[PDB]
């Protein structure tokens, strides 16, 4: 986490304008659509057969909001991500069996989602701060795998 103060202010300013409910659903849904293999973890979510079925599935929307919820909390402890995400890392490893590469895919999708939403406001340099952040979070989520 080589977030320069200026990088951290930038992450934080934009995060201020996000509707976590909304972004969460879009990021998650979009992942299931761009990398359909990731659907392996959600066969109890029902119909993921088409983009509309995925994007609109109440379960995907509810789960996305959960995920971004946890991510948001993450952004308030940019200093202690590993600590922050520890029990979650254990859970994904030991109970859920989620390959950590999944965490990086979601980070990239998330970045495209922010670009989608903020247009011109998601500047080259803001994107670079968010790149460091999604990466820090994925790493923190993978820290307890064994």
């Amino acid at each position: 986490m080589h977030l320069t103060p200026e990088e951290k202010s930038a992450v934080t300013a934009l995060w201020g304008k996000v509707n976590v409910d909304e972004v969460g659903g879009e990021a998650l849904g979009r992942l299931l659509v761009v990398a359909p293999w990731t659907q392996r973890f959600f066969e109890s979510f029902g119909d993921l057969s088409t983009p509309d079925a995925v994007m609109g599935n109440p379960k995907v929307k509810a789960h996305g909001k959960k995920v971004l919820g946890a991510f948001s909390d993450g952004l308030a402890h940019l200093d202690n991500l590993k600590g922050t995400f520890a029990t979650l890392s254990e859970l994904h490893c030991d109970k859920l069996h989620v390959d950590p590469e999944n965490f990086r895919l979601l980070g990239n999708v998330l970045v495209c989602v922010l670009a989608h939403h903020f247009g011109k406001e998601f500047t080259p340099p803001v994107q670079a701060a968010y790149q460091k952040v999604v990466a820090g979070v994925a790493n923190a989520l993978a820290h307890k795998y064994h």
């Binding site: 983009p51 995925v54 495209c112 989602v113 670009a115 247009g119 340099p125």
Partner: protein, 141 residues
């Protein structure tokens, strides 16, 4: 492989790019430079400063090539042969970097086409950029 659907998607989204391709190409590059500084090692000879004409010049060439692959969506291996040759033999860019540029191109398009950048279109553009990258890297060994 790209499906009819994908093909339609790509022609459509790229259609909208129109005359901004050049500028979007320049922007994808700058984003790439800023987010993945390791990609810079390939451009030791460039002025990578903000608004560098070298970058503008280069963004345009990248954009023309993407535009050419869209025009020949059914024969990309042949439409891009030359560029495949150049990259394999002269530039010798490590393959991992294609995915980085791909990613920055997707961010750029998303930042400019909110209306078209639907989940379905996003997926198609991603498969497309991946196929372009595969062609460009096909003759590496």
């Amino acid at each position: 492989v790209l499906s009819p659907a994908d093909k339609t998607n790509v022609k459509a989204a790229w259609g909208k790019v129109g005359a901004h391709a050049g500028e979007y190409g320049a922007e994808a590059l700058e984003r790439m430079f800023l987010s993945f500084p390791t990609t810079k090692t390939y451009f030791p000879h460039f002025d990578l400063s903000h608004g560098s004409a070298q970058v503008k010049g280069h963004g345009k060439k990248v954009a023309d090539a993407l535009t050419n692959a869209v025009a020949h969506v059914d024969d990309m291996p042949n439409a891009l042969s030359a560029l495949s040759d150049l990259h394999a033999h002269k530039l010798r860019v490590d393959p991992v970097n294609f995915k980085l540029l791909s990613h920055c191109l997707l961010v750029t398009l998303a930042a400019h086409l909110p209306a078209e950048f639907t989940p379905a279109v996003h997926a198609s553009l991603d498969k497309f950029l991946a196929s372009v990258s595969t062609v460009l890297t096909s003759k590496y060994r």
